[PDB]
């Protein structure tokens, strides 16, 4: 069975959940954002509390698409977990064959194509609030393997009618369908505690988001309004529609035309076209990308940033608060979602017997930080010759080395 | 005035005495009358569709 | 298919078998609606743009309706025989044989 | 007498309910109202 | 919903679809008690307090 | 039947007493007769086409 205890069948595993639902596979994105008020975005967040997700994800991915420092900071925050060092550990004071079996995984995992790729798909749910990756399944004889992942949009799910923290699939059916025990690779973040559907940061992105898209829009349309001066002509009593066409077409291309000519009679009023500066769209739009660096990659390094600075030390300083607590804190979440995800099927599915469930083998991410190798090596042998006995494989673990074999 | 006509020589779909066809350009937008009525009349504009308000 | 055994190996009688065709045309189905660019976008409250899920679930359930509209159609349309699908006069034979 | 066929696992529910507030306590104890200073020792 | 799939001879009718918007307002409900302050503590069985 | 006219709002290539014209609407697809002919009948559909059956 899996880690839930729902009774696991290997007769559903030939084929995908999806795949007797065609129609998702025609949809096309409805791209929400373009057109968007205030007004429609609070409508749109509400909706999707009630379970309505397929609007709510749409306006997340042209969110992440339109805003080029969003995407920047979402980018450089997954890419920072998607170069970290990960590796399989047995469980506390493991048996023999406990650790055979974590080899085992270990070994499988190294050889499995594609999962860089799961890595970047199950992290869309940091944004979104939860990522939904597609299993295949199949028997290369005896051993079952997963053939690929399939990452579905978020648009596919909704929320349970009768519980607001279990997603289903969109089956055209007022209650959607469960989703299949050992066919997903479910993501879900935790950034605040609450329901999935108020989880994803981009509910916390998206105002900032919509003012900095209108301070942009605003300021493009004044600087192209910016220029010529508006110069209104005025015409007697008794001016023909031919003669009014002429004075027309003369103010028209007055702006561009350095000189021109007119009777006495008529008159031409150079206004004020639009006259002040870009100070308050430029205010706008970086108090708002402050407030997306500060949400997304914390105010002590991206918006305040950190400034430069050198030294042993210095690597400490810049990581060690806000940037440490955040890197452990998803690759903590994103190793808990594989452990219990793709390592436990493969444990039960791949070896014999029923392991007990607590005794599983947990994916570690390596989130060992760099420790000054010239000042610990001073202070070591003042130590030793104190008359410590410092263990070596506390040495060998913090600094990197590895044990001689 | 008449918010749109959407005539092109073509009404939707002018069922009388038991058939349907398509000739007499009667389409309309609006809900000044008739609107269950002017579901079955329209909602079928099989050719192309000229709108050139009356102002009506 | 071979009929049945016949009674003489004397004289014996040769016989034929016969080619069955059935044509059918596979012409097309389809449904659409109208809406305005700027009411899409207009649209806050997330209606007025299910429009493609719901188009595609029709599409889905189409095949359905197709399948049945032919089997209400059955005691009108004709089979590879000449005769309605549901008929009392199927000419299986000189002889007459029905399924209505 | 009363009858009534409705379904129960289609996406909507028949008869809806709206539970627009919850059951908010609305109380009159002491020093908040004037029921208890200038007339009788009531409560509601 | 939308109009039924169609056949198909020679041209697509661009069919439309209607709406049944449905409207009804909210009502207010409310019950109380009047009781005397003194009583509620002018009592021994732990009676008319959860009241 | 007449699967389709191809007539609305189109003309074709008519080739008559030495003189091919455009105009009477004679567009068809359909393999019945003249199939050779159809090719100089359809030899000049200028216009936007628009099909309707005539159920013939």
């Known amino acids: ?160 009618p009768e519980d607001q923290n279990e997603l289903r699939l969109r089956d055209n059916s007022p209650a959607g369908e469960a989703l299949q025990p050992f066919g997903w690779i479910i993501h879900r973040p935790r950034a605040r505690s609450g329901y999935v559907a108020r989880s994803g940061l981009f509910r916390v992105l998206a105002w900032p988001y919509l003012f900095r898209h209108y301070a942009t829009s605003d300021l493009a349309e004044m600087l192209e309004i910016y220029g010529l001066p508006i110069r209104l002509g005025k015409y007697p009593p008794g001016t023909a529609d031919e003669e009014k066409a002429t004075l027309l077409r003369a103010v028209t291309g007055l702006g561009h035309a350095a000189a021109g000519i007119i009777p006495e009679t008529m008159a031409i009023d150079f206004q004020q076209a639009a006259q002040g500066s870009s100070d308050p769209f430029l205010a706008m739009m970086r108090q708002s990308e402050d407030a997306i660096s500060k949400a997304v990659l914390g105010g002590t390094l991206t918006s305040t940033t950190s400034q430069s600075g050198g030294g042993a030390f210095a690597l400490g300083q810049v990581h060690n608060e806000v940037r440490h607590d955040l890197l452990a804190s998803d690759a903590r979440q994103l190793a808990a979602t594989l452990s219990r995800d793709l390592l436990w099927p493969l444990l039960v599915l791949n070896r014999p017997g029923s392991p007990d469930v607590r005794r599983a083998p947990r994916l570690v991410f390596d989130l060992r930080e760099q420790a000054d190798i010239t000042s610990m090596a001073q202070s070591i042998p003042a130590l030793v010759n104190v008359g410590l006995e410092i263990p070596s494989a506390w040495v060998y673990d913090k600094l990197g080395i590895p044990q001689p074999a | 005035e008449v918010e749109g006509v959407f005539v092109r020589a073509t009404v939707e779909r002018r069922c009388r005495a038991g058939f349907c066809f398509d000739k007499e350009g009667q389409g309309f937008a609006d809900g000044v009358l008739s609107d269950e009525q002017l579901e079955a009349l329209e909602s079928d504009p099989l050719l192309k569709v000229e709108r050139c308000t009356f102002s009506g | 298919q071979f009929p049945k055994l016949r009674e003489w190996i004397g004289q014996r009688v040769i016989k034929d078998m016969a080619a069955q065709g059935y044509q059918i045309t596979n012409k097309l189905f389809e449904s659409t609606v109208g809406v305005k660019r700027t009411d899409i976008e207009d649209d806050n409250l997330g209606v007025y743009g299910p429009l493609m899920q719901e188009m595609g679930r029709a599409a889905g359930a189409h095949p359905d309706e197709l399948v049945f509209a032919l089997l209400k159609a059955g005691n009108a349309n004709l089979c590879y025989d000449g005769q309605n699908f549901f008929d009392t006069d199927h000419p299986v034979y000189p002889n007459v044989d029905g399924t209505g | 007498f009363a009858p009534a066929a409705d379904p129960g696992a289609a996406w909507y529910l028949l008869d809806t309910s709206r539970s627009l507030k919850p059951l908010i306590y609305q109380e009159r104890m002491k020093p908040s109202f004037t029921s208890m200073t200038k007339e009788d020792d009531e409560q509601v």
């Open chain 1, 1 to 160: 069975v899996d880690v839930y205890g729902n009774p696991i069948r290997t007769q559903q595993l030939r084929e995908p959940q999806t795949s007797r639902l065609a129609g998702l596979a025609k949809e096309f994105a409805q791209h929400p954002a373009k057109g968007l008020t205030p007004a429609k975005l609070a409508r749109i967040l509400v909706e999707a509390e009630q379970g309505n997700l397929q609007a709510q994800a749409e306006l997340f991915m042209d969110m992440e698409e339109r805003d080029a420092h969003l995407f920047a900071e979402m980018s450089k925050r997954k890419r920072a977990i998607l170069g970290l060092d990960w590796a399989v550990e047995p469980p506390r004071n493991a048996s023999a064959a406990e650790k055979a079996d974590a080899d085992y995984l270990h070994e499988l995992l190294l050889d499995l194509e594609g999962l860089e790729d799961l890595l970047l798909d199950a992290l869309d749910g940091i944004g979104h609030g939860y990522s939904c990756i597609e299993l295949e399944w199949a028997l290369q004889g005896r051993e079952w393997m997963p053939l690929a992942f399939h990452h579905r949009p978020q648009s596919w799910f909704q929320l349970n």
